[PDB]
Structures are given as structure tokens and as C-alpha cells.
Design a protein around this nucleic acid. Structure first.
Length: 109
RNA sequence: CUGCAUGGCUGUCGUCAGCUCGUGUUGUGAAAUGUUGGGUUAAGUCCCGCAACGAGCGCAACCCUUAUCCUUUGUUGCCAG
């Protein structure tokens, strides 16, 4: 009820040194993650996303996997938001004033 | 009188597929990246994709002629009817 979510446990090798402490003691040599902080850690981050929305910040969403690539353009369409669903460029965001010539190209075609 | 005094004008490596530029990245930096890779070609040509996205000179097309046809003008040329 504290959220918490789905576990199998999946991946048995090469764990990230900052994610290893989320493993819990159930069975000999068995990998399984504890998720009892998912929404408790989101409730404090969504407070600063509220501060960026208060500052009228432009929000960008990204996904390429089949569960996310369709959702970034449909599941948040109750506000004004921007997305990337499949294809990327060199300097996609860090060279935006060059990338604008491809938006002039898009609209000209 | 002479192209280390010149402007200009044409050869040749070279009709070869090369040489550069705006912004971004990379290194202390000259610079490198882009022009490489993977297919394809007559070709830095076209396609695919990537830290690149687009450009300038070459490139290529338009241009012109030629193999077959249809149609307009025919002498002192031509001669099918």
C-alpha cells in the first residue's frame, strides 16, 4: 500500500554499486530488489517538479521501448508537453540553434 | 627585354572525385570531427545510419545533337502519284 511495485527478481550479474543496497535477505544466492521507497521518494521530487511548473518550465519526455515510445505522446496530453519517441541527432538539445534549420525544413516540406 | 613587377588568359597532376565553411564536440594546443563507417556508382553519386545538421567550388541536369515515327514548305533540285 506504501508503493512498492513489481519484482521477480531480475538480473543476477554485474549490479550497479549504488543499487546493490536495495537487495533484501530472503534466500541463499537469490537476487531480489526492495521497492518500498518508490512513491515516498517520488512525493518529494514531484514537489520540485511543481516548483519548475510554477516557474513555467518547458517539460521534455523521452522513450524508445514499446511501453514508453507510444505513451510520451498520449499519456500526458492533458497538459502542453514535448517528446522524443525513436530517432536522435548529434547535439539533439545541446546545439538547438543549428537543429532549428531541420524544423524550418520540416515545415517547408 | 622578361611572367619573384603585373592585370589577364590557357595548359597539366585532373572530367579526377577531390578542397573548403557556419554552429556543436574533442585536446594545453597546431588541428581532428563533419568529408569517415555500411551498401551502391560514372561520381564527396544516391541510399542507410552515427556527434552531427546544413552549406560553398567541383559534381549533375537543364542545353545540343543522334537511332524510329508523325506533320508543315518544295526550285533551276527531286520524281513516288
Amino acid at each position: 500500500m506504501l508503493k512498492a511495485g513489481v519484482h521477480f527478481g531480475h538480473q543476477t550479474r554485474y549490479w550497479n554499486p549504488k543499487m546493490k543496497p536495495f537487495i533484501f535477505g530472503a534466500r541463499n544466492k537469490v537476487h531480489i530488489i526492495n521497492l518500498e521507497k518508490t512513491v515516498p521518494m517520488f512525493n518529494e521530487a514531484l514537489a520540485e517538479l511543481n516548483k519548475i511548473a510554477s516557474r513555467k518550465g518547458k517539460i521534455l519526455f523521452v522513450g524508445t521501448k514499446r511501453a514508453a515510445s507510444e505513451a510520451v505522446k498520449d499519456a500526458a496530453l492533458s497538459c502542453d508537453q514535448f517528446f522524443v519517441n525513436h530517432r536522435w541527432l548529434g547535439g539533439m538539445l545541446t546545439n538547438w540553434k543549428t537543429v532549428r534549420q531541420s524544423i524550418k525544413r520540416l515545415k517547408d516540406l
